[PDB]
Amino acid sequence: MAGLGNVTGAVASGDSLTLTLDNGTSASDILELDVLSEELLRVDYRPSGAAPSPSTPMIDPDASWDAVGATIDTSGDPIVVTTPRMRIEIARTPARMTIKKADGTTLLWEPASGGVFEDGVRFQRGSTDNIYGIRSFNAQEDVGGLLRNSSDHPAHAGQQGDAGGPFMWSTAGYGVLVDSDGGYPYTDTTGKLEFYYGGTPTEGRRYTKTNVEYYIMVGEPKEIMASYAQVTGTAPMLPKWSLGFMNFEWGIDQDELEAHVDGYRARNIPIDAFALDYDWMDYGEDNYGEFRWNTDNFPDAATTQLKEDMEAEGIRLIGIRKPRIITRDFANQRTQQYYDADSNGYFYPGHNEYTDYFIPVTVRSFDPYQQASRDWWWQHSIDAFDKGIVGWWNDETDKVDSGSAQYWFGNFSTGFTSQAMYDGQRDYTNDGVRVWQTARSYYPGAQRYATTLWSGDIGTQFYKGELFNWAPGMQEQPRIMLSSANLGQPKWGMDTGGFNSLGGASGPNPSPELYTRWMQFGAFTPVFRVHGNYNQQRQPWLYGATAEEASKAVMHTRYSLLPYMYAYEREASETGLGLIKPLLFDYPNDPQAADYTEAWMFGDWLLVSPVLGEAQHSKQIYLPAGTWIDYHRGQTYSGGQTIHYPVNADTWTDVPLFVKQGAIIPNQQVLDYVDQQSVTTVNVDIFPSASETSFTYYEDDGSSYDYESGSSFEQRLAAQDLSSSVRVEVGAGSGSYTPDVQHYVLKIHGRAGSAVTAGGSALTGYGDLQALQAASGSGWASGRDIYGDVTYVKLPAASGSATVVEVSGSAPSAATHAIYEVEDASRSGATPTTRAGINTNHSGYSGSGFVDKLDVPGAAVTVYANAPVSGDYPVELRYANGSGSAKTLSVYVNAARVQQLSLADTGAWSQWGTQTTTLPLTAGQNIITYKYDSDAGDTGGVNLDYIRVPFAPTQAEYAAESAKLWGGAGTSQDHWFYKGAAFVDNLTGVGAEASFDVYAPSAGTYNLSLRYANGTGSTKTLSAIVNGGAASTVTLTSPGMNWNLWNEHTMTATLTAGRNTISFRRNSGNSGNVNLDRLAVSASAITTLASERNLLDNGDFERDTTYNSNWTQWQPSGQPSAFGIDSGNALHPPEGPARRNQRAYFHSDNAYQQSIHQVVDVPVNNATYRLEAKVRMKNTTPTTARAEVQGHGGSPIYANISNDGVWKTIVIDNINVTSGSVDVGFYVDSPGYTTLHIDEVTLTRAP
Amino acid sequence: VGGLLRNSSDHPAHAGQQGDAGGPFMWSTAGYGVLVDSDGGYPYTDTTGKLEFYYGGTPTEGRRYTKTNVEYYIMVGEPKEIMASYAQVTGTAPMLPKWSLGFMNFEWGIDQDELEAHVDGYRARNIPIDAFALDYDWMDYGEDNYGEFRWNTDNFPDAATTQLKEDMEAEGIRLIGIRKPRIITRDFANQRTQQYYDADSNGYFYPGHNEYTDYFIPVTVRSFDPYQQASRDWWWQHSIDAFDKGIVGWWNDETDKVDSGSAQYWFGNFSTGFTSQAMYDGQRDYTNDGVRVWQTARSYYPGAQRYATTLWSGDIGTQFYKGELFNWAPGMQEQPRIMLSSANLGQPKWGMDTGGFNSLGGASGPNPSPELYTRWMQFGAFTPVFRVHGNYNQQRQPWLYGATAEEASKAVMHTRYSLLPYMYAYEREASETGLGLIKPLLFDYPNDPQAADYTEAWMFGDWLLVSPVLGEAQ
């Protein structure tokens, strides 16, 4: 904010004057003045004499003036330029310009305080001078006058009929024009007349100028304006017809046009032109539709005929143009115009795609408050109902939000809209089809008419403000749900996956992580539904294998709980309480439940707390008074505390779910839909408490209002743990509905009895659950499951009288394995009629059958096996192979391809064998899938009978990132070759620690191995603290100055049966300053874990892309990178990862070469290794697309990638390494538009 | 999104919008509830111990059930007992079909083939699902004869009969359909609908809700960059065909600002000039300077004039003045000030939508009155770019406004057209000095204080001063 310095040189030459100004440095400022006309001066200020920037497009590039012959007198102070019309004085000390008329009248001057500077011009003039220019007003603004005597409005083009620019002039005889892209003119009534470049204005700035180029005009307004047009350009002449009247019109076609022109001509009302709005063009369509004549509206525009016929009637045509292209046709296909624009960079910078609307329609709200209005609404709805609309999604019953229409519906609109459909559908069907509706508001009473509530247009993000701030996301939703419940509307759901994104419908889908977590969440809410914006897709397979499998998994849990759930639907008809409730319902005096929403009750007997955090490794979960049993992991917790709960951030398989002691939970086989088949056996899991608890099992038709007049079935189930037995009462049948249930199978957890009695009779004992199920009439059996000892008791349901069962004694199973019969498991395949099957047509099977039709590509069977801790589980597959030779099948665990199983011929189809494979399981639920994956080279073609999963692993693992961290310990991905989804760093402050919860079957000494990094150069120390006992020192050597190296610290620890705490803390004497990754635990010597075989760093590309990996890339010199890593969720439909959240891609609009490589030193030189990857290719066939192995001692090995669109597995086996290292790579050579996706790359030591 | 606690609460009791819920129902885990019968109202709590409820004034949402008495309920018990009592007073919930405990896929942008393929994708994977919910796709929303209640057989051919219902039932799929509590009162062809006539004659529209123009087919678009030569070449190249077949003037709209949903993007100050430059350079090359360019844009920044463009005053209001009918757009009376402000910035080739663009309720709203129309045509005829325009399916031919509007319009048009050779000289003048057909009086009278802010009259060429009648009933 400072003016020019003194003149140190003046060089006149023709009409130019060049001034050098002192700024105190060797690089002086320049000020070039040019006299352009007698009444027009150019001034260019170049700070430090640097070259001027290019002139903006304000300036006419072709402007040209006659020589003026001005008089420039450099002899005196001031320096003096004169013409006949003006006099310019520049004082020397400091340099200051005064502008005058020839006659000496002062027009304006730069003040002492400062004139021109680096960022603008500053003048002073007569304070009563009237100023003009700068700005106009738009069609949304208050409209001022012409005077600009107190102005600070920016100079901009503006919008909606605005005009403006850096042009301030006065009727007092002068004008000032500054070459600028936007900026801030300033005037006030002290006489100031200023212009500042200022900061980037709202409209953007794409022409910046290091210089200040300005023009000073002198004269009357006509002369001022003439000079403005010499500088900025004159207007070319419009066609003469442009002086005529024109009729602009929106909503018009060729017939109407012709009528309109006839009307004008018949009445001798002149007219030269019509302007046509959207009507004229095929806006919305492919092939440059927004440039081509709409021949539906204007048929004769197929040729020049329309032009020529209107010419003959004296009509020229004008056509509307929007400076934008349609990037998606009405069929949701990328347009040709998109491809051309995207490839050549023709989109406006900073403007992304966005969703517009363009066909208007006129609507008006209906009144549901009137009975006669409601009847009419229903009567016109009947035809839609008979043709299959049987649920009513009653949208927008709350508020209209649309231009000038901001109208509110009243508080009873949702109830009355709902009543219309309810009284209506009830009358028409004679109480024979139950009503289902949803609305997006609730007020009391509305529930009488059978409506749910959904949370409206929520955002596709983790929480409010993650991605944008105008809608909440996933994390807020439990608070909405529980608030609805506190209002007596527990029948609630949400748009799982979110509705809104930045840019509207074209905005991103949810990430695979966000989608997976949201499905896990919604499976434990009452109205379980996905939704999204226009042309968005929400099918779980589109989000990659983790999202598919985890979603499937939690959906199986929900559907297995149908009989549990449905009893709550019944309760809502008696008391209004439904399937969910907040903890404060059950714990009204617990201050920790008062505002608790991160967990909630699902029915009476399950507390659920979904993982809602992005990249979350552990949850803090409040458990209120009682005793809780982990649904998936088996351990107990006592209530009245907040627990630390590890979750596997890599698999996304956990849904933290806890059984309340007392629980009586009816459940059933998984159906594809609710009434797919009759269910004749209901399971009832019972976890007895010392006080009686009960559950009233309930059936009815599921369809009609018959239940209202007694047509239903109920039976009261009740349980109690006694001093030395468990008592369970199956009360007598009640009601008139003949239920489908024939037998309950009670699963009484906590005791494996030696006897089960009832009415003076000891029930017949069978050897196992299987043999019990196959028996007719009553029995018992016992076993072990994830929870511990269990007693099974099979009974008739729907007896006319009460049955009281008492399980006594304790005779625990010695079973070491659970058995899952795969014919009870999940059967799938590529199409609905090529799924794997159940069969009994060969002998020797266990259970009720085995699984066949693993002989069409993609056929598979999927078992959900619970594990108490993470680790190595040797899982036995019983199968038959009567094909004459060995057959292959993939084993997938938690959506990762673990192994190709080679299954030997067994002699015949009725002869069975066993293959045992060590599986990397995670604590809680695991997804184990045996699949014919022809794209991985499997053959399929075997039959599977069961699998056997040990109750205990051979060795356990615990992730450091999922441990309780304290004292500054945190998680990080900022170094390479960690296992799992992260590691623990920042063990630097005293008190910093990681505390593992380790389980043991028996008291004893166990081996530990702790995986740690130490790149400090020297040995460092932590303390180990087992069960709060005495600190032992842990001495951790350093491989060197390198944080990408990991070693094992081996040690023993004395442990107790059950839960143990083992901490690694920096105590005051310890030095700290190491990174921890995983603790392995076993009764035997610890070996390589099945989860940790991968020698690559970031082989799954899951690492947050802010952080690097051992991957490197290459392209030819001067080519942009074609390589990135992301989730594919921006695309519609999503092109998702193969597993978890991310995948590498190669893509370019133009021709390209691209590779990525990773080099690793192998653990054992002179041995065999193996490369596996998932790869997907689409669009243009490339010249080369391959996996590559090289640098290993032998010559390059290649495996080609085949253009398809689908995820395939590429494998390079028998990599004989003799160099000590291996380079694995992927390379594409493309002519353009080849997309390659790479995922799940593993380099392992090969059998 | 807050918590569950309502310990310091003044939020009103309403149904709300967009997933909201509320009511005059206040209860505590300390062992009590309070339910008041009310249509809206104002619950109040605070940490000194107040638990209050006020009817107060008419809410935002309206109030159709007013009450002289005060009917309330006190509940005593633990939370589940309070909630049961609430359901005794306001109603228990009827049981929903059992399938409604299943998974449901809701979708917007779906036809029969896609639905079938989705369902096949679930079943093939043994991923359970009981229901698809269909958005607008399922219905002939926008058409006559109750189209907003009728299956769209272009998207769902087999919903012509019970076939879709039945094949989907066989696959374990129930169908849900979206409903909107409104009807279309003008079909796509601007014709009043059967459903309109039925609701109007029976009184079935929501009180206080007039009709209004909504939009319903979404399209995806992206702005082009006219700042680059190769972009302009491309834009022109693709316009040649439309030009050969009769588009000889370029009405370049929305070169200023995107105001659309979440999308709020500005174009730069040279956007108009450069858009204009694309058509100018192009047409001139292609016709070898044989066909004069004409264009209009709704913004002006200096230099844009070089590329042959006029300026229009945007989506102005169909009204005499700002605030006569609505406050959010100016009307006719303001337009001289805008025109003359453009002139002072060197853009005298200026026009306006004679008749106005915007009315209350959108395109469905009122045309100009004959008086407004007539006075505006008279004014228009003495401005440089003389044009009527209006909103979607609105009409601006003068004969529709009755015989005074017809005849007075004709008359003033005849005056304008007789002045062709007077006018055309000023067109020539704008090619030499940039001065044009209008100018404010302060150009001729730079020292007259009565001319300094004067915009109720102006000069049309050098020798005529015009001051159109713009007051109602003046």
Ligand SMILES: C[C@H]1O[C@H](O[C@H]2[C@H](O)[C@@H](O)[C@@H](O[C@H]3[C@H](O)[C@@H](O)[C@@H](O)O[C@@H]3CO)O[C@@H]2CO)[C@H](O)[C@@H](O)[C@@H]1N[C@H]1C=C(CO)[C@@H](O)[C@H](O)[C@H]1O
């Ligand atoms: C048709 C017009 O649509 C867009 O702008 C209009 C809005 O959609 C309207 O809702 C209205 O907005 C106002 C609110 O209703 C009101 O409550 C208040 O908040 O003010 C708002 C205005 O600030 O009016 C808008 C302006 O007309 C769109 O942005 C606009 O460009 C559209 N007009 C052009 C389009 C066509 C159709 O091709 C042409 O016929 C016109 O000449 C164009 O200027």
Ligand SMILES: C[C@H]1O[C@H](O[C@H]2[C@H](O)[C@@H](O)[C@@H](O[C@H]3[C@H](O)[C@@H](O)[C@@H](O)O[C@@H]3CO)O[C@@H]2CO)[C@H](O)[C@@H](O)[C@@H]1N[C@H]1C=C(CO)[C@@H](O)[C@H](O)[C@H]1O
């Ligand atoms: C489709 C949806 O549209 C309407 O509301 C949405 C707006 O159209 C969007 O532009 C967006 O507005 C936000 C601005 O982008 C943002 O800058 C900020 O100002 O906040 C605005 C909103 O607070 O989002 C709006 C909300 O989605 C309309 O009012 C709404 O009812 C519409 N949603 C229903 C329509 C369909 C299609 O039939 C259903 O699929 C949905 O489930 C409905 O809820």
Ligand SMILES: OC[C@H]1O[C@H](O[C@H]2[C@H](O)[C@@H](O)[C@@H](O)O[C@@H]2CO)[C@H](O)[C@@H](O)[C@@H]1O
């Ligand atoms: O009014 C003159 C003023 O202009 C500049 O400030 C700009 C600022 O850069 C913009 O970001 C925006 O907020 O508008 C302002 C003007 O309204 C100068 O930096 C300042 O010194 C000067 O007084």
Ligand SMILES: [Ca+2]
């Ligand atoms: Ca079996």
Ligand SMILES: [Ca+2]
């Ligand atoms: Ca780890």
Ligand SMILES: [Ca+2]
């Ligand atoms: Ca991955």
Ligand SMILES: [Mg+2]
């Ligand atoms: Mg010169």
Ligand SMILES: [Mg+2]
């Ligand atoms: Mg004054």
Ligand SMILES: [Mg+2]
């Ligand atoms: Mg600068």
Ligand SMILES: [Mg+2]
């Ligand atoms: Mg029309």
Ligand SMILES: [Mg+2]
């Ligand atoms: Mg004709």
Ligand SMILES: [Mg+2]
């Ligand atoms: Mg066409």
Ligand SMILES: [Mg+2]
């Ligand atoms: Mg779709």
Ligand SMILES: [Mg+2]
């Ligand atoms: Mg089919």
Ligand SMILES: [Mg+2]
């Ligand atoms: Mg139809």
Ligand code: NI
């Ligand atoms: Ni402005």
